[PDB]
Design a protein around this ligand. Structure first.
Ligand SMILES: *[C@@H]1O[C@H](CO)[C@@H](O[C@@H]2O[C@H](CO)[C@@H](O[C@@H]3O[C@H](CO[C@H]4O[C@H](CO)[C@@H](O)[C@H](O[C@H]5O[C@H](CO)[C@@H](O)[C@H](O)[C@@H]5O[C@H]5O[C@H](CO)[C@@H](O)[C@H](O)[C@@H]5O)[C@@H]4O)[C@@H](O)[C@H](O[C@H]4O[C@H](CO)[C@@H](O)[C@H](O)[C@@H]4O[C@H]4O[C@H](CO)[C@@H](O)[C@H](O)[C@@H]4O)[C@@H]3O)[C@H](O)[C@H]2NC(C)=O)[C@H](O)[C@H]1NC(C)=O
Ligand SMILES: CCCc1c(OC[C@@H](O)COc2ccc3c(=O)cc(C(=O)O)oc3c2CCC)ccc(C(C)=O)c1O
Ligand SMILES: [Ca+2]
Ligand SMILES: [Cl-]
Ligand SMILES: [K+]
Ligand SMILES: [Zn+2]
Length: 805
């Protein structure tokens, strides 16, 4: 119950919301059906529209009007935004030449440049070029300020998960808004776009920017706007708040537009009906900038123009129906659309079985347009698993398609032509970023980056310490003229041992054999030198990775590769080697097919054993440094050391062998040499973070050899490919992957074909950032380069996406 008999007189769009059942006058009261009786009359005036006209200039103030053209409006802070243009002969901001904003030019009483975030729903990255003729204000912000060609949203590429990621710097699995619809089984509560449950604070985790600001004594405008407040009024409200006394005035504001997403769903992303929505958003930007210019703040405020996600062509005839696959369709609940999430309809149904659901959905139809996954098997770059609100079964839907439970769901819920939510590497889902202001650079293009990085920068713009988040703070310093954040590299926690030869061959009883009894004073000195690190500079190009947790490990040197070998996990944490453009691929010799060799530097008690692999009928082994790429017949023996072996299912060895035999050389040819760092990852609790030894769910049978959930590689080369990877004087280029270590290849529907038809496609799906591998391993890479640390942080956040341009 709300006592709406109270009044909004002198309270319109008040910043703090008042306590029920007292009636409200803030920008959210409509959504709660709780505004005072006179909120429309007082706070949503529309009389005479939004624009001054010649005849209104110097009018007698009429408090009924939506906005004012009377002489006193500039001191009241409520002129129509075009007041000075119409009445005082000023120019629109868009018609003024771009002039660099070298320092903030602010009115007295401004303690810091305010931040205004202008967020637009469904604003696809390619609109910046494709719509540029009809968006002159947005085009000026973009050309004059700092802009990226696009900004990568988070998955799923839905509205609330992405806007809340902008607010928090967190992945949706961490902030809790994991879709536009959700069931939380602990709460036993459902979140929906429509209605009231979504306002309950227990959905919204982390700490959004407006709370970060408030806790640190920086005041904030509200970021939510009730949908029925027109945009012109949202702009006038922000401009009014900017005229508050210094002690009352917020420093951060957010405007939101439901367009162009609203029309994109109806008309598709490039429907001819889309030009008008884009012109209308441009006009709104123009209102803001003219209004800032009136207030003399257009060279004071930092403006962010940012979108949540793009928009794809999706029509009802491109719908896959689970009723075409599952016998049991009424025993499941599906969250449908551009992604699928499945759970049991009833928790009391003992016949429900996820394994049989997955199998029935796996590669059943030739052009099948979705792929099922247990959530722990989804590409790690999505970071979409570690939340109870995310159903164990997930469907990754192809761009341009929907998935639904039954045909009747599509016509008893087809005029819609656009949608979004797909994999956040899809080109159509990319969205926009422009920053304009004294704190941003002038006429500067920056590379694409992920929206999870923006919170930290917004905190930097406001002089706030960010709450703990998933951005990499410093990775976007290149967007800024000032206020950069200058991080120090993390300190190394464990230092390595450097073992020499300490064990005789007969101390090892590992059940291994190798045909290696096959032999000089020229050659003997050189082998000792290699084992002491004499080639290390060739193979370890960016320093040893630092281990950021407490553990016991050894550095092992070899002619062709260097490794950091964990005594705890019995295998390398990392294996680093360089392959020049000229390197030759060789085979594993017939006499060496099953060769595994004790490492006389590492005790038997800290080694793997071959007998565990013979006994484990499901598990085989591979090597981290590939024997195919040995520099010489003699150096090849090093590749079969028990310290270079790792556990691999046979089905995974098909992937791994193709990568090592064919792809590494192909990348070295293409990129003019590569440096490779490969290793295992253990993330049995799918939290994106390195497991401790006690979290490991599976071991090679009979042994203490832990089985990795994934295998990674980081492939680095020179950005200027005229220079070889090992002699690069400038910026680097990287691509990386985190391949799932699975016992079948059911994810790849073409896997019965030759590896050349499916393996690289698998690897591309599981592309990763170096930062993702760092979280998963507790390793810190690139510690010794010639590059600035901020540039290296940007390199670590890079994702090679494989989409066209
Ligand atoms: C992306 O960035 C984020 C932010 O930095 C990273 O997330 C952090 O990860 C940390 C490790 O996973 C984690 O630290 C834990 O915090 C526990 C206290 O948590 C509460 O308080 C904080 C602070 O305000 C709050 O933010 C938390 O918010 C979560 O939960 C609420 C309510 O459920 C949600 O609204 C919110 O969305 C958020 O949910 C997300 O995180 C939780 C985990 O906290 C997940 O369960 C959800 O699925 C969702 O992802 C909390 O309200 C603290 O109690 C933990 O300490 C225990 O475990 C450690 C193990 O190291 C041990 O040292 C301790 O002894 C202790 O053990 C005891 O409890 C165990 C578990 O019950 C039990 O098994 C033991 O036997 C012991 O009794 C732990 O320190 C931190 O909370 C999150 N923060 C956030 C905001 O998500 C994230 O890792 C980054 N991602 C990547 C890939 O880098
Ligand atoms: C979502 C987090 C907050 C946030 C931002 O929210 C802006 C906020 O007005 C968006 O709210 C929306 C958006 C769509 C719909 C609907 O389609 C339907 C319905 C309904 O039927 O009720 O309600 C909606 C609401 C709720 C109106 C209270 C914007 C930008 C940011 C940034 C930049 O951080 C940010 O954090
Ligand atoms: Ca983990
Ligand atoms: Cl959803
Ligand atoms: K085996
Ligand atoms: Zn939408």
């Amino acid at each position: 119950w709300t006592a709406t008999s109270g009044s909004c007189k002198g309270r319109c769009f008040e910043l703090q919301e008042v306590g029920p059942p007292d009636c409200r006058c803030d920008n959210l009261c409509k959504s709660y059906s709780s505004c005072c009786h006179d909120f429309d009359e007082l706070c949503l005036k529309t009389a005479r529209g939004w624009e001054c006209t010649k005849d209104r200039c110097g009018e007698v103030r009429n408090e009924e009007n939506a906005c004012h053209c009377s002489e006193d409006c500039l001191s009241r802070g409520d002129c129509c935004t075009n007041y000075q243009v119409v009445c005082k002969g000023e120019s629109h901001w868009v018609d003024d030449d771009c002039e660099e904003i070298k320092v903030p030019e602010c009115p007295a009483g401004f303690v810091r440049p305010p931040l205004i975030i202008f967020s637009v729903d469904g604003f696809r990255a390619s609109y910046m070029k494709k719509g540029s003729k009809v968006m002159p204000n947005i085009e000026k912000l973009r050309s004059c300020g700092t802009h990226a060609p696009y900004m990568r949203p988070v998955y799923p590429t839905k509205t609330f998960p992405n806007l809340y990621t902008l607010a928090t710097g967190l992945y949706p699995e961490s902030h809790g808004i994991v879709g536009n619809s959700m069931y939380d089984p602990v709460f036993d509560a459902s979140f929906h776009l429509r209605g009231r449950e979504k306002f309950n604070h227990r959905w919204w985790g982390g700490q959004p920017l407006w709370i970060t600001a408030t806790k640190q004594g920086v005041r904030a405008g509200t970021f939510f706007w009730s949908v029925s407040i027109p945009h012109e009024r949202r702009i006038l409200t922000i401009l009014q708040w900017l005229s508050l006394p210094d002690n009352e005035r917020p420093s951060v504001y957010a405007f939101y537009s439901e367009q162009p997403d609203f029309s994109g769903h109806k008309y598709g992303p490039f429907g001819p009906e889309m030009t008008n929505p884009l012109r209308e958003i441009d006009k709104t930007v123009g209102q803001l900038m003219d209004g800032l210019k009136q207030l003399r703040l257009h060279r004071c405020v930092n403006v962010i123009f940012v979108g949540d996600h793009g928009m794809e062509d999706v029509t009802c005839d491109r719908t896959e129906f689970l009723s075409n696959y599952l016998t049991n369709v009424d025993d499941i609940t599906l969250v449908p659309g551009t992604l699928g999430r499945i759970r049991a309809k009833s928790i009391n149904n003992s016949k429900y079985d996820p394994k049989t659901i997955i199998a029935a959905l796996t590669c059943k139809k030739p052009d099948q347009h979705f792929k099922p996954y247990m959530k722990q098997h989804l590409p790690k770059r999505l970071h979409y698993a570690n939340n109870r609100r995310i159903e164990d079964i997930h469907l990754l839907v192809d761009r341009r398609w929907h998935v639904a439970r039954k045909p009747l769901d599509v016509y008893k819920k087809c005029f819609f032509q656009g949608d979004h939510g797909f994999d956040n590497k899809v080109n159509s889902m990319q969205t926009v970023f422009v920053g304009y202001g004294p704190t941003f650079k002038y006429r500067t293009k920056v590379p694409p980056f992920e929206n999870i990085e923006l919170y930290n920068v917004m905190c930097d713009l406001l002089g706030l310490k960010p709450a703990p988040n998933n951005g990499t703070h410093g990775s976007l310093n290149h967007l800024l003229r000032t206020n950069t954040f200058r991080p120090t590299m993390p300190d190394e926690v464990s230092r390595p041992n450097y073992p020499g030869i300490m064990y005789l061959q007969s101390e090892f009883d590992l059940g291994c054999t190798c045909d290696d009894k096959v032999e000089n004073k020229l050659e003997e000195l050189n082998k000792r030198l290699h084992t002491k690190g004499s080639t290390k500079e060739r193979h370890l190009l960016y320093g040893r990775p630092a281990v950021l947790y407490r553990t016991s490990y050894d550095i092992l040197y070899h002619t062709d590769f260097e490794s950091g070998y964990s005594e705890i996990f019995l295998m390398p944490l990392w294996t680093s080697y360089t392959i020049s453009k000229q390197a030759e691929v060789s085979s594993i010799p017939e006499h060496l097919t099953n060769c595994v060799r004790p490492d006389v530097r590492v005790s038997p008690g800290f080694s793997q054993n071959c007998l565990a692999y013979k006994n484990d009928k499901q598990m085989s082994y591979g090597f981290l440094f590939p024997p195919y790429l040995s520099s010489s017949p003699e150096a090849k023996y090093d590749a079969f050391l028990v310290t270079n072996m790792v556990p691999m299912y046979p089905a995974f060895k098909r992937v791994w062998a193709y990568f090592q035999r064919v792809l590494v050389k192909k990348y070295a040819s293409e990129r003019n040499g590569v440096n490779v760092i490969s290793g295992p990852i253990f993330d049995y609790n799918y939290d994106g973070l390195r497991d401790t030894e006690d979290e490991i769910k599976q071991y090679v049978e009979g042994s203490s050899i832990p089985v990795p959930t994934h295998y990674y590689s980081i492939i680095t080369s020179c950005l200027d490919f005229t220079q070889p990877a090992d002699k690069c004087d400038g910026p680097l280029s990287v691509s990386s992957f985190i391949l799932p270590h699975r016992p079948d290849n059911d994810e790849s529907c073409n896997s019965s074909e030759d590896e050349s038809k499916w393996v690289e496609e698998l690897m591309k799906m599981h592309t990763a950032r170096v930062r993702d591998i760092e979280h998963l391993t507790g390793l810190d890479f690139y510690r010794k380069t010639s590059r600035s640390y901020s540039e290296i942080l940007t390199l670590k956040t890079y994702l090679h996406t494989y989409e066209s341009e």
